[PDB]
Amino acid sequence: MNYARFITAASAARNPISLAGGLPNPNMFPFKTAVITVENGKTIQFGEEMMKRALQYSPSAGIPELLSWLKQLQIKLHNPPTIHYPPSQGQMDLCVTSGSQQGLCKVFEMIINPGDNVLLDEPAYSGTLQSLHPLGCNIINVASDESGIVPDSLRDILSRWKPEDAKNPQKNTPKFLYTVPNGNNPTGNSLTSERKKEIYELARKYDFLIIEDDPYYFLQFNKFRVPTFLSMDVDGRVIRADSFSKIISSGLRIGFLTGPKPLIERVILHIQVSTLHPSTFNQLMISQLLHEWGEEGFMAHVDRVIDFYSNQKDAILAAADKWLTGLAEWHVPAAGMFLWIKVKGINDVKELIEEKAVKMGVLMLPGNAFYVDSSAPSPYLRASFSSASPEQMDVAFQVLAQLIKESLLV
Numbered sequence: 001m002n003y004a005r006f007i008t009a010a011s012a013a014r015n016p017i018s019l020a021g022g023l024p025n026p027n028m029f030p031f032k033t034a035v036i037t038v039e040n041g042k043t044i045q046f047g048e049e050m051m052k053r054a055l056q057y058s059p060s061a062g063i064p065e066l067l068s069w070l071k072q073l074q075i076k077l078h079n080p081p082t083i084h085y086p087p088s089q090g091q092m093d094l095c096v097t098s099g100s101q102q103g104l105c106k107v108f109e110m111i112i113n114p115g116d117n118v119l120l121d122e123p124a125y126s127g128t129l130q131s132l133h134p135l136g137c138n139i140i141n142v143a144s145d146e147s148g149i150v151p152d153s154l155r156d157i158l159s160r161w162k163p164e165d166a167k168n169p170q171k172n173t174p175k176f177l178y179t180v181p182n183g184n185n186p187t188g189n190s191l192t193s194e195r196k197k198e199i200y201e202l203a204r205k206y207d208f209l210i211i212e213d214d215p216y217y218f219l220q221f222n223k224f225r226v227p228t229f230l231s232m233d234v235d236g237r238v239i240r241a242d243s244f245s246k247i248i249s250s251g252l253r254i255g256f257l258t259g260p261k262p263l264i265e266r267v268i269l270h271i272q273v274s275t276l277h278p279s280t281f282n283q284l285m286i287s288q289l290l291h292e293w294g295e296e297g298f299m300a301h302v303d304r305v306i307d308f309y310s311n312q313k314d315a316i317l318a319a320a321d322k323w324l325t326g327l328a329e330w331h332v333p334a335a336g337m338f339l340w341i342k343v344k345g346i347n348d349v350k351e352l353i354e355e356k357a358v359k360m361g362v363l364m365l366p367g368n369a370f371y372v373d374s375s376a377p378s379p380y381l382r383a384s385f386s387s388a389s390p391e392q393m394d395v396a397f398q399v400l401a402q403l404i405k406e407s408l409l410v
């Protein structure tokens with residue numbers, strides 16, 4: 001594998017008793033000791049020495065024990081083929097980020113030169129669209145559905161090029177394909193094992209990278225979790241983004257990238273000149289807890305959380321059924337925390353949200369946000385079952401429905 005091709009010139013030009021130590025004196029920091037309790041788990045303690053560790057600078061790719069525990073999990077969950085490959089051949093490498101957004105952004109940054117082609121299915125994450133836009137890439141939209149990206153659409157799109165063209169600079173082959181394989185923001189649609197095989201196979205034929213942005217992986221209502229692109233990455237073409245935001249803490253800013261050693265190493269260098277490293281305090285906070293828990297301790301917690309949002313999914317749907325009677329259309333969310341609604345008989349919905357819905361104390365995101373062309377009208381809504389109560393959901397839909405009707409009288 002040649003990683004140099006997928007890389008931007010600036011990325012490749014990146015570069016890595018002691019008085020050398022450009023670190024401040026630890027004994028000069030005000031916060032002396034910490035005690036953090038955990039429900040259905042033990043108690044975390046940050047003693048004098050542990051606190052001095054937590055308050056001082058850290059490795060950059062992450063704290064050693066957080067990186068080891070995560071490495072163990074990535075193998076124990078995806079057993080990536082790349083595990084024992086030579087580094088140059090795309091050997092599996094991990095990297096702790098200050099949220100999964102840091103991982104993705106840095107990856108996009110290290111890949112995209114203005115003019116480069118990117119494969120992505122619309123509607124896609126606002127944050128990533130927002131990331132790629134200033135970057136200068138051409139987003140080629142790949143046709144999706146309830147089961148995700150249609151391998152056939154990707155198959156048709158790729159037919160523009162020849163499988164040899166990937167080797168040829170002068171031929172602008174797609175640098176990567178971007179997907180949310182489980183519970184896509186904003187649709188909530190998840191891919192299938194079959195389709196993923198077809199897509200990976202397509203990635204091989206046309207030789208492009210796959211950035212697997214999977215934050216709602218642990219939040220699968222599916223029962224037996226579907227195998228990942230990383231879990232099937234023979235070549236070493238997968239950059240996989242995991243998040244602790246949806247299960248452990250969004251505020252702590254601790255995410256984790258898993259991909260080929262050369263590519264991960266390219267992001268690590270960028271973070272060296274950007275944030276230096278993620279909060280050593282929070283990395284230790286996560287580490288210590290999920291260490292004393294174990295993989296069983298972790299999997300119990302994940303199950304506990306999936307069955308909360310399962311009822312939240314059940315709840316919002318039990319509401320949509322009641323109030324969106326036949327005023328809109330929706331797919332049962334596969335995973336994650338979003339319900340994606342198609343308001344029947346209306347071209348644009350943005351108006352009757354930030355002007356009609358808000359004044360009614362109900363607010364949910366218009367679909368416009370999830371498209372490259374934000375100007376073009378959307379009859380879509382993205383409703384979050386992450387927080388609102390069944391009562392709240394009921395009171396929310398009863399409003400929304402009212403508004404759907406008024407605009408139907410125009």
Ligand SMILES: Cc1ncc(COP(=O)(O)O)c(CNc2cc3ccccc3n(O)c2=O)c1O
Nearest residue numbers: 099100101125180185213215243244245250255
């Ligand atoms: C697919 C995908 N990739 C990356 C991220 C960010 O990952 P993180 O850093 O691990 O939390 C996200 C989080 N998505 C959202 C976050 C959010 C935060 C504040 C306010 C609104 C937010 N809305 O709207 C979101 O959808 C995501 O959906």
Ligand SMILES: [Cl-]
Nearest residue numbers: 170171172173
């Ligand atoms: Cl071309």
